[PDB]
Design a protein around this nucleic acid. Structure first.
Ligand SMILES: Nc1ncnc2c1ncn2[C@@H]1O[C@H](COP(=O)(O)OP(=O)(O)OP(=O)(O)O)[C@@H](O)[C@H]1O
Ligand SMILES: Nc1ncnc2c1ncn2[C@@H]1O[C@H](COP(=O)(O)OP(=O)(O)OP(=O)(O)O)[C@@H](O)[C@H]1O
Ligand SMILES: [Mn+2]
Ligand SMILES: [Mn+2]
Ligand SMILES: [Mn+2]
Ligand SMILES: [Mn+2]
Ligand SMILES: [Zn+2]
Ligand SMILES: [Zn+2]
Lengths: 356, 348
DNA sequence: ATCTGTACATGTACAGAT
DNA sequence: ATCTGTACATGTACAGAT
DNA sequence: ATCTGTACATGTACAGAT
DNA sequence: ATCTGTACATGTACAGAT
């Protein structure tokens, strides 16, 4: 009931959705069309909407949209980057519009991203209907981010992705453990869909920096978010409603509110809570372990699970089991203990950060 | 325990499946070849396997197989025949055939008969044509008797006909998303090959949802994991097998049941699966009461003379027009007897 | 004349609104 | 409870191309 | 256009375990 | 008696090659 009111605060307004989507779809459509023009290296690129807004777990406002511009690259060979599981070099087999981004048969990611960014920047210049600019590049980001002032501020991440239709890389063989929850047929069908590669774009100074790509499963996460129950009728008009998405929203909002205040939490991002709850949904497969009447204890057990991931320094990528999002190389102990304490304080004092 | 032993009897043998299928697949691949490996009107026909063998509810022997040869036809107008729900006139390569079902079936049949004639490695012939059948039926002996029904079908990719809008009522069982996706698939038309002497009989086709029934049979739980390797077994298919066996055994003995077919049983269990959607209502420990509830539901269908097409609800398969009252009362008496005596007919 | 990539046309699950 | 805007899957029309 | 290759669903069969 | 793990078998979706 206390959490029932927070969700009411977090709920998007149709008026805002309508206003924001009108602008966003206009800008996205124009950019998609410019990539189809001339001898553009990105001709054939197709659009895939992803992220919280299209999973219906966007909270507070419709002010951030994620969209994949995906390009199918056939006849592709991958080299895993130093057994990390998630990062790859991409290589080609013949001697192609990606000609100008090739090196030693190796597809440069920062070369491709730069050209992609240059096209988007020029196209944005010739929009005089909407107040829209291109954000300064961020290290580690695979995206060209648009800032729309619709009056209201709106971010759009245009994510460049390679699309391979072959079978998924073996580092994912033990990932996606949905057998006891969504089952073997769903798992088999999901793994028949393409996989995606986005630029790592780390800028950190290490070898292969500009030629490292990162696996993306945004499309698989979108399907799961929207087909999340063991029962096919879960959250449908002739079935029972669960509180799975509501628990994600509350967890997202806790991290968002804390990150707004404490810049010690810069290492953390909402993908961490999204990954955590995919494990909770696998651990607790039954729709009855997510009854809306038990929202408080369902949110609590998610917090307890997240706190144990922070303390034990282990939050395995849901799709790549050997990739630890909470490794020391990515987040130091200090950052994790700080978040542990901040969460435990919220937990134990009525969630006062929900009232800010 | 009695029912478990019956199901052990009904179970097909790996060796039998392997010998029957490699011969059936030989013949079918060759007919499918001929259909487009010639300037025939059926160039572009594609194969779709259907029926109990491919749903894994075939019982006793692998001795009957069903195959659709389906052909895409663009821009066709349907016209419902006299409000029957299931039967239609088709209208606008094939212009040798208003699209007459009788005219198309016969050329299709003539092709198959010719290709069967030039098969020398398998003992195979074409059964005499049956009024009422949309099929060309092949008889194989290797030495086991095996019959194959080659079913000609038109494939339309528009919205399903209006008479189905109330059909397929899976919303509380498989859900709205499965229903919407199933209805995004094509719908099929097959010949109505009756000789009854009625008016438009020769150019009427009948709706087929064999493709949709296959998906259901193999995606039948309310839980996605039903009968999967990380899920629980249910006894839904076993119940269909048992009810199928009861009717097969009765039809063997009683000529009075010639009007009944396994599709009646299949239809009745689709309604029971919709009435009782929870997988726990089909627990394997409760096989007996599950079988009994199917019997009771089937008997209520007989008693009220009402068994609606699961996809076309106004089409009553138990109409007085199609099955006489005395047939239904005869079958009622025989089922009530088997029920009340421990199913003696299951022991022979 | 026919061919075809682009985009309209149709239908409905999701979830906010009343 | 019903009404309703957006997203999205798939079927089809046709301007401009061949 | 056609056809093989791959992966894993659905089954049956059976020994060893419970 | 049933359950579980491995072996053995066919069916079917679709990527990629030719
Ligand atoms: N570090 C990451 N590793 C893998 N995938 C990621 C990562 N960060 C983001 N993604 C993918 O990109 C999508 C968009 O990311 P984003 O940061 O906008 O979050 P979101 O899930 O849309 O939620 P919100 O925008 O409301 O914070 C995610 O849903 C996820 O699929
Ligand atoms: N009267 C009918 N109306 C509609 N569809 C039918 C009818 N009879 C058969 N079919 C379709 O054709 C398929 C093949 O029918 P068939 O008579 O071979 O039975 P079956 O379901 O395969 O089982 P079995 O052959 O083991 O009795 C059916 O499963 C169904 O999809
Ligand atoms: Mn986002
Ligand atoms: Mn983003
Ligand atoms: Mn059959
Ligand atoms: Mn048949
Ligand atoms: Zn749900
Ligand atoms: Zn089952």
């Amino acid at each position: 009931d206390k959490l029932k009111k927070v969700l009411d605060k977090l709920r998007l307004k149709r008026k805002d959705i309508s206003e924001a989507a009108e602008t966003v779809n206009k800008v996205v459509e124009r950019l998609l069309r410019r990539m189809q023009k001339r001898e553009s290296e990105f001709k054939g690129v197709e659009q895939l909407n992803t992220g919280s807004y299209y999973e219906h777990v966007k909270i507070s406002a419709p002010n951030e949209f994620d969209v994949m511009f995906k390009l199918e690259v056939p006849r592709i060979e991958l080299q895993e980057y130093y057994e990390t599981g998630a990062f790859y070099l991409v290589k080609f087999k013949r001697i192609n519009p990606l000609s100008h981004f090739l090196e030693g048969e190796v597809l440069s990611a920062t070369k491709m991203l730069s050209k992609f960014r240059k096209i988007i920047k020029e196209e944005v210049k010739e929009i005089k209907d909407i107040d829209v600019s291109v954000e300064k590049e961020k290290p580690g980001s695979p995206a060209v981010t648009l800032l729309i002032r619709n009056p209201e501020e709106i971010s759009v991440d245009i994510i460049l992705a390679l699309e391979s239709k072959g079978s998924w890389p073996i580092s994912t063989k033990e990932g996606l453990p949905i057998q006891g929850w969504l089952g073997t047929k769903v798992r088999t069908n999901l793994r028949r869909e393409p996989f995606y590669l986005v630029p790592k774009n780390a800028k950190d100074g290490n070898s292969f920096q500009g030629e490292t790509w990162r696996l993306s499963f945004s499309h698989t996460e979108k399907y799961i978010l929207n087909n999340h129950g063991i029962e096919k009728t879960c959250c449908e008009s002739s079935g029972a409603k669960c509180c799975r998405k509501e628990c994600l929203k509350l967890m997202k909002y806790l991290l968002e509110q804390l990150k707004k205040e404490f810049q010690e939490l810069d290492a953390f991002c909402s993908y961490h809570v999204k990954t955590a709850i995919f494990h909770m949904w696998t651990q607790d497969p039954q729709d009855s372990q997510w009854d809306p009447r038990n929202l408080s204890s369902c949110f609590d057990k998610l917090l307890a699970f997240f706190l144990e991931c922070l303390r034990t320094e282990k939050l395995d990528h849901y799709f790549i089991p050997k990739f630890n999002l909470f490794s020391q190389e990515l987040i130091d102990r200090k950052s994790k203990e700080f978040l542990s304490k901040k969460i435990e304080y919220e937990r134990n004092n009525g969630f006062p950060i929900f009232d800010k």
